[PDB]
Amino acid sequence: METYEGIIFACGKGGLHEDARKILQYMTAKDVVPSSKAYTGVIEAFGQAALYEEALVAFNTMHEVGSNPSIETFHSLLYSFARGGLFKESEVILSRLVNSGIPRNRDTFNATIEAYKQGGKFEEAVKTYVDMEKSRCDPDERTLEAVLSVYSCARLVDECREQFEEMKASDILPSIMCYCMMLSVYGKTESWDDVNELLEEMLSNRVSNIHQVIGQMIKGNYDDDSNWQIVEYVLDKLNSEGCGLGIRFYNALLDALWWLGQKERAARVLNEATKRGIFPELFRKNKLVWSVDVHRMSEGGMYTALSVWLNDLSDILPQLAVVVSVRGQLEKSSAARESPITRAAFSFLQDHVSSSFSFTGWNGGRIMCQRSQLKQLNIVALTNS
């Protein structure tokens, strides 16, 4: 019992869906009724790798064996649905919570916050923020981080720096997040003076080491073979709190690097993240489908992934090269057509490879390119500013 739960929790934290699945089958093969905690662990393990259907199947099987859902199971469900931007599943689970009578803690509120942020619903995000402040409870660092990310995404510099100066007044040792999307938002409007004034304080960082390393390497001082090793050890050290934090860290870093003119550095960061285990759904290569998944990424992370995906396509044939802009219930609707992810990907492909990547006549959240259009096709110039 203890060994099964420990292994399953470790796999879920580390995003090892396959190992958790194998443990589940082995322990079910011995006529052992699974507990709620182990089922929650395997569900959250499946959600790390964006395997929503497997997590939903496990959640459905949870009630079959008599294991009732707990608060941790719901927290994992909201976090997994929020990472992918599936806000419809988010409000469905919220309705399930409201009809189950369980009180909503900060986890539900902030999971909804980033679920609407990744889905592009900025107005609903701020509405849910004001509702969170209306009722009760104190937002943690995660809530203000999510609102800073949503403000940076929706071209709001002024509220961004207001929240920045408000949050740093609490002596909280601001994390990699805040700096990363602050560089991103300042690079949105070519605020080179603000970027430099942030970097001047960022470079020293007498307190922590991670900030110093990343601030040195973003400027290009750590690009050498020996000078990238410090970045590699700091990345390895950071790969211990879990893939849930790793995906956010890589998203923020990629957005900052892409929006600061460091396209080659962003490409190399994405390349080193792929072998780590973060973004396991990023690339699929087979005779049938050559796909890139971006529904869990930010705008900056999408552009870096698309840039390196286009370059690999020109090197080489699959029956179809597709872009998974939106994944979830929104696919069978016109709502995903207007989504910021879909329109951003479409505009990027349109201005880079001309009118070759068309939409899908059956799916509302995919960008399509037949093999015939692949036949007629270094495409994206990756340079450091």
């Binding site: 939903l56 459905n60 099987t61 949870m62 009630h63 079959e64 599943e89 469905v92 219930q329």
Partner: peptide, 17 residues
């Protein structure tokens, strides 16, 4: 006379939607 001849799948598995 009358005595002659001795006289659950598909549940908890619906579409999430």
């Amino acid at each position: 006379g009358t005595g002659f001849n001795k006289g659950d799948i598909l549940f908890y598995h619906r579409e999430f939607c």
